[PDB]
């Protein structure tokens, strides 16, 4: 009834969707077969006459391997076969390939299934698009689909949980190129874009989870827990319910500035669990710690503009107010002069469910801090030099040109990220 349509594009999108849907199935009690032994699942699942609940999700990818892993995995009887959409040729880390030549038919079929899915929803709170800025499928096809949704669906709230490349560590070479292109695209389509960095989540797993060998499964589990914390107010009741439509108005000062840091707390393994108090004040301070940011961007360089806190579990409103008042009186945390309030608290009575086989511990309290802060322009500043350093020699440019792209598009994307730099500088300024 408060349905949100889930879209997962590219390898990273689909692989974080794996963890997300495992988490949602565990949270609502839905077995992998499709049915469970009120109406809290309607946000993520549509129940059929036979009792089988099918998730309102769409797995879009131009490479068949990742989707076939889902088709053969434990969740083969849960997902809809036509909802899993598989391409023939991968985008090959080419934004032009994923946005101009291969992506057209796939996105047409994607909008077909998305229209069918949205028909089965009475209301529609919005879309949750999980993709990977830094690869052709994520960048190109994701940008194309976001344009499609923005134009046709229109005023539905699209939350893009994008993963940008890390400052130093990376796995692709044209990753600055396609990242700049997809940021140029999604600056104008998504309503709230959640920033993620693999380096930051790796550091989180290394220090807090004590995982010396973090992997994509752990990263995606953490991301899934963050998104479940985001959506807990849609599916479970609690004091200070926060809505998907409430997020933007409470968090977006200006149309372009909608990129948001996400930070979960606590991140503690079972062995370290139940050994500290993990009170509301302590978990709030941990959430505001610079290291807890899921993006390699120090909050101290910038100033917070808005901070939306999602509390899950046994949280009392005086405790949230006392913790946040201590945060305001803290000297390290600095807000802009023009947003004296800058805080959007929302509590929920459902503690975060734990995935068996994971490292996260069963904690009766959880906080997801999603903050709009002017600091995040630093990551765009990094990519703005990573891009132009290669573009000066026009390396790998012919690959993008071959699939229907032009020098003007590269130049315009660089211009637009420079514009975003100036926008962050200006929101930081008095």
């Amino acid at each position: 009834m408060r349905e949100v349509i889930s879209i997962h594009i590219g390898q990273a999108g689909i692989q974080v969707g794996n963890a997300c849907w495992e988490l949602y199935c565990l949270e609502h009690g839905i077995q992998p077969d499709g049915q469970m032994p009120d109406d809290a699942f309607n946000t993520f699942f549509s129940e059929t006459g036979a009792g089988k609940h099918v998730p309102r999700c769409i797995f879009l990818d131009l490479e068949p391997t990742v989707v076939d892993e889902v088709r053969t995995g434990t969740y083969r009887q849960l997902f809809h076969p036509e909802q899993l959409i598989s391409g023939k040729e991968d985008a090959a880390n080419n934004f032009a390939r994923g946005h101009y030549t291969i992506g057209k038919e796939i996105v047409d079929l994607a909008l077909d299934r998305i229209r069918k899915l949205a028909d089965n929803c009475t209301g529609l709170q919005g879309f949750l698009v999980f993709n990977a800025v830094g690869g052709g499928t994520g960048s190109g096809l994701g940008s194309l689909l976001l344009e499609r949704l923005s134009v046709d669906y229109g005023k539905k709230s699209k939350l893009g949980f994008t993963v940008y490349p890390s400052p130093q560590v990376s796995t692709a070479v044209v990753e600055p190129y396609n990242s700049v292109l997809s940021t140029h695209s999604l600056l104008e389509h998504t309503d709230v874009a959640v920033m993620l960095d693999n380096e930051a989540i790796y550091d989180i797993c290394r220090r807090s989870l004590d995982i010396e060998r973090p992997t994509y499964t752990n990263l995606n589990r953490l991301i899934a827990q963050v998104i479940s914390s985001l959506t807990a107010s849609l599916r479970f009741d609690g004091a200070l319910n926060v809505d998907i439509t409430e997020f933007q108005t409470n968090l977006v000062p200006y149309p372009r500035i909608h990129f948001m840091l996400s930070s979960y707390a606590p991140i503690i393994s079972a062995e370290k669990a139940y050994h500290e108090q993990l009170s509301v004040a302590e978990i709030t301070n941990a959430a505001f710690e610079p290291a807890s940011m899921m993006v390699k961007c120090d909050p101290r360089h910038g100033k917070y503009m808005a901070c939306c806190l999602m509390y899950r579990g046994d949280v009392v409103p005086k405790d949230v107010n006392a913790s946040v008042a201590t945060i305001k009186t803290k000297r390290t945390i600095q807000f802009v002069d023009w947003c004296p309030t800058g805080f959007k608290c929302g509590i929920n009575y459902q503690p975060p469910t734990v995935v068996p086989g994971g490292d996260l511990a069963k904690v009766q309290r959880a906080v997801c801090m999603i903050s709009n802060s002017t600091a995040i322009g630093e990551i765009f500043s990094r990519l703005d030099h990573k891009f132009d350093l290669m573009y000066a020699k026009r390396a790998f440019v012919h690959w993008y040109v071959g699939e229907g792209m032009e020098e003007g598009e590269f130049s315009e994307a660089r211009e637009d990220l420079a514009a975003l730099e100036k926008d962050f500088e200006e929101v930081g300024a008095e």
Binding site: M1, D38, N120, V151, D152, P255, A392, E415, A418, K422
Partner: protein
């Protein structure tokens, strides 16, 4: 009046401090949001029923007796509370019937009040997009490669400044062309908020 004057002062100071034009500003992007909202509402209202959704209930039960209202219960009979959708297909509700443009805004004068400009040639920023594209084409024809040196940072013109705002989408043009007759039926004329 005093707050208007301070808006000019604040915007001038910010533009001086940063370097971008006062029009290409975070604060002065409210009208763009309003135009986008109006466009989305009009595009949602102007759709054939298949595009609006092939829902058997929405298509038949609402349409019967031209009631156009559906009962959505919120649980069992014991809840007994439900939503009347009360949706009339092909008509804007009176609340959203109004189109709004700022006619006194000094900065919005070049566009002419914004609004809906529902004709495809009028969507977005046609003049700015044409000028930017022509300049790019002239540079390409003269062989003037851009981004020669990394120490030269980009100018930083906005999406609307370069003519790639959300209202400038090629999909927006295509879909308004598709839905044009019904879009005319809903909104016969573009208000011309400037005058």
């Amino acid at each position: 009046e005093q707050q208007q004057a301070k808006w000019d002062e604040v915007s001038s100071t910010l533009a001086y401090r940063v370097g971008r034009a006062p029009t290409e500003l975070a604060m002065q992007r409210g009208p763009a949001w309003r135009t986008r909202a109006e466009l989305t509402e009009l595009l949602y209202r102007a759709q054939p029923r298949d595009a609006r959704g092939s829902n058997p209930d929405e298509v038949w039960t609402a349409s019967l007796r031209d009631a156009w209202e559906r009962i959505l219960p919120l649980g069992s009979i014991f809840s007994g509370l439900a939503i009347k959708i009360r949706d009339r297909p092909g008509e804007l509700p009176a609340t959203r019937a109004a189109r709004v443009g700022r006619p006194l805004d000094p900065l919005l004068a070049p566009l002419g009040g914004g609004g809906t400009t529902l004709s495809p040639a009028t969507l977005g920023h046609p003049a700015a997009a044409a000028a930017h594209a022509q300049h790019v084409a002239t540079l390409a024809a003269n062989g003037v490669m851009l981004g020669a040196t990394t120490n030269k940072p980009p100018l930083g013109r906005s999406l609307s400044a370069r003519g790639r705002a959300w209202e400038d989408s090629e999909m927006l043009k295509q879909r308004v062309a598709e839905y044009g007759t019904r879009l005319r039926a809903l909104a016969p004329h573009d208000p011309d908020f400037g005058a």
